[PDB]
């Protein structure tokens, strides 16, 4: 659901990873702030030629188009059956 | 005529022109490196 009504500011609290060395595995997270290298020369941890910062933020401006509008995406994930049932459809255990 | 200008002018090219006013013969290659066919190529990777 769009946070345009609330989180739109631009909103630079919300941020994305503009580049990474490869594609992700499922549910894989990266907190590394390390500096990017697009060349063969070590960057010495600075931006520049073939050296950038891979984490960029999407600016969310209430005047942005629906493409640049923010959306709050939430996923409720479950293993289906055969596993201990903790969250359940509110149907009580019969006799 | 008035406000009518010829697009393509030829320098006078005089051997007495300076290093930067002398006509240079200037070529620029176009090649796509990898990802496109090898026709002009070295060994490519050609092993023994």
């Amino acid at each position: 659901w769009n946070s345009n009504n609330l989180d739109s500011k631009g909103n630079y609290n919300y941020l994305y990873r503009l580049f990474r060395k490869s594609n992700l595995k499922p549910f894989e997270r990266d907190i590394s702030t390390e500096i990017y290298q697009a060349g063969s020369t070590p960057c010495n941890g600075v931006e520049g030629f073939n050296c950038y910062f891979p984490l960029q933020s999407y600016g969310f401006q209430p005047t942005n188009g629906v493409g640049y509008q923010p959306y709050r995406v939430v996923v409720l994930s479950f293993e289906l059956l055969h596993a201990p049932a903790t969250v359940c459809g509110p149907k009580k255990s019969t006799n | 005529g008035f406000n009518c200008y010829f697009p393509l002018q030829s320098y006078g090219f005089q051997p007495t022109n300076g290093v930067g006013y002398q006509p240079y013969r200037v070529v620029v290659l176009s090649f796509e490196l990898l990802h496109a066919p090898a026709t002009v190529c070295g060994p490519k990777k050609s092993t023994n």
Partner: antibody, heavy 119, light 106 residues
Framework: VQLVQSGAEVKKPGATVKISCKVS????????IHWVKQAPGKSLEWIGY????????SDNLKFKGAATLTADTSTDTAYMELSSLRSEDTAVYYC?????????????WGQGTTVTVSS | IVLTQSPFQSVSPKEKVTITCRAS??????LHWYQQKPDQSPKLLIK???QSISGIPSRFSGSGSGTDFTLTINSLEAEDFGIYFC?????????FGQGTKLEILK
């Protein structure tokens, strides 16, 4: 006008000495920064000029260290990272500011980077 | 693009020394010059072979004719001594002059 460079080094043959040359006292972007190899007991020998806006650089055939002159516009640093290192790559490498045309005019180079390349 | 300089010229004070940069095969009007005191950033004496860049003393001068490219230096001073480099321009990358070590008599 002014150039600050990488520190002194002793480098393995085949390793890579990365010599930064950082632009001070002038604008990185307006000038080819030439690079020249003065080895101990030798004279100046051309390796390459960098372009600050143009990553593509003419490199010397001669001694070829696969020298790649990378033009860093954030820190205004023309890098020479010299691979294919050798005891003759022991040298004082002067990064030389010069015009961006086929006008090559280079007066105050880097202070010199005294880099031994040796085992 | 091939040139070479005399390995050194040992001259005397108050004498004039015209240092030779003699280029092989093709030549262009543009050429450059230097003095380098040992182990120091080479300082450009001449520009386009026709121009002493600003800041270079009047005794340091330059010219060229065909393959000949000259740094004309005048009235040596005992402190001046250094190594004098030249630069071939264009015609594919360059051989810096091998340098002239200035050994001043007197």
């Amino acid at each position: 006008v002014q150039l600050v460079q990488s520190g002194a080094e002793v480098k393995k043959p085949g390793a890579t000495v990365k010599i930064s040359c950082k632009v001070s006292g002038y604008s990185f972007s307006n000038y080819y920064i030439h690079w020249v190899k003065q080895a101990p007991g030798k004279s100046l020998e051309w390796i390459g000029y960098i372009d600050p806006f143009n990553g593509g650089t003419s490199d010397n055939l001669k001694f070829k260290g696969a020298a790649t002159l990378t033009a860093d516009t954030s820190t205004d640093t023309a890098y020479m990272e010299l691979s294919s290192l050798r005891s003759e790559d022991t040298a004082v490498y002067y990064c030389a500011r010069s015009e961006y045309d086929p006008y090559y005019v280079m007066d105050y180079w880097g202070q010199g980077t005294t880099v031994t390349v040796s085992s | 693009i091939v040139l070479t300089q005399s390995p050194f010229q040992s001259v005397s004070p108050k004498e004039k020394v015209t240092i030779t940069c003699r280029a092989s095969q093709s030549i262009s009007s543009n050429l450059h010059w230097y003095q380098q005191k040992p182990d120091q950033s080479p300082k450009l004496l001449i520009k386009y072979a026709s121009q002493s860049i600003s800041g270079i003393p009047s005794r340091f001068s330059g010219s060229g004719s065909g393959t000949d490219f000259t740094l004309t230096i005048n009235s040596l001073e005992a402190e001046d001594f250094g190594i004098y480099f030249c630069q071939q321009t264009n015609f594919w990358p360059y051989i810096f002059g091998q340098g002239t070590k200035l050994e001043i008599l007197k």
